[PDB]
Amino acid sequence: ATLFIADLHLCVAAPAITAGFLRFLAGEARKADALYILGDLFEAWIGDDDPNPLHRKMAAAIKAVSDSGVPCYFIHGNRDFLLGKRFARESGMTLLPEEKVLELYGRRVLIMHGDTLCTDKVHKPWLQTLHSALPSHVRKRIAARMRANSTDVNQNAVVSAMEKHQVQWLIHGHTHRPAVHELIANQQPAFRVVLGAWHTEGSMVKVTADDVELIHFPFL
Numbered sequence: 326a327t328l329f330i331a332d333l334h335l336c337v338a339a340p341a342i343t344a345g346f347l348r349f350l351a352g353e354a355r356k357a358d359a360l361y362i363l364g365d366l367f368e369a370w371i372g373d374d375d376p377n378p379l380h381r382k383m384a385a386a387i388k389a390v391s392d393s394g395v396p397c398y399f400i401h402g403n404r405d406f407l408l409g410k411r412f413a414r415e416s417g418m419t420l421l422p423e424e425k426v427l428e429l430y431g432r433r434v435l436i437m438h439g440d441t442l443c444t445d446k447v448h449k450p451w452l453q454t455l456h457s458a459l460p461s462h463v464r465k466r467i468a469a470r471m472r473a474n475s476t477d478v479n480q481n482a483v484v485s486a487m488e489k490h491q492v493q494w495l496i497h498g499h500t501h502r503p504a505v506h507e508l509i510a511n512q513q514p515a516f517r518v519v520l521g522a523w524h525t526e527g528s529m530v531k532v533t534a535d536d537v538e539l540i541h542f543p544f545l
């Protein structure tokens with residue numbers, strides 16, 4: 326089984342969530358084929374080496390999952406888009422681009438945080454370099470945050486991303502509204518599975534060869 330979670334918004338002031346995440350990593354995650362964390366794992370992020378005991382503890386708990394044989398992957402959210410390679414190495418996670426297609430048990434599945442779907446130069450390299458100065462997953466987040474500091478997902482964006490990636494399944498979070506949506510893409514049926522935030526209960530998408538399901542579980 327391949328597991329997907331997001332929107333934990335971990336912080337020192339919310340230790341029950343952190344405890345529930347540790348239980349998850351030490352139990353369910355150990356039995357998975359892989360674990361995908363689709364952004365907003367932390368409420369905020371600046372420096373990979375910030376003095377934060379919470380960061381050290383989470384990195385070691387995640388690294389203990391991957392060390393046990395369960396690969397771990399991370400797609401940045403709008404809260405933790407500065408999380409970098411150093412922390413990925415500390416935690417044993419692979420960082421993924423803002424949109425990624427997986428081949429899960431014969432099916433193509435698009436994963437992303439979901440904020441780039443909203444829910445509120447190229448020809449010349451020397452010129453292109455200037456635009457790609459920061460990784461795309463940082464450039465778009467920084468621009469949106471700056472605009473929002475100065476002053477539901479868009480359906481056209483959903484379709485457009487599923488036709489661009491030739492995909493009938495999409496998993497994301499960000500909106501904090503867990504649900505399963507049906508739609509049309511690529512002249513076929515398509516589905517968009519939305520994760521929930523961990524403010525009061527955990528949630529995951531569990532994908533197997535036979536089933537996908539959106540599951541909620543208490544922190545215990």
Ligand SMILES: [Cl-]
Nearest residue numbers: 403404470473
């Ligand atoms: Cl934000």
Ligand SMILES: [Mn+2]
Nearest residue numbers: 332365499522
């Ligand atoms: Mn979130």
Ligand SMILES: [Mn+2]
Nearest residue numbers: 365402403499
């Ligand atoms: Mn978000």
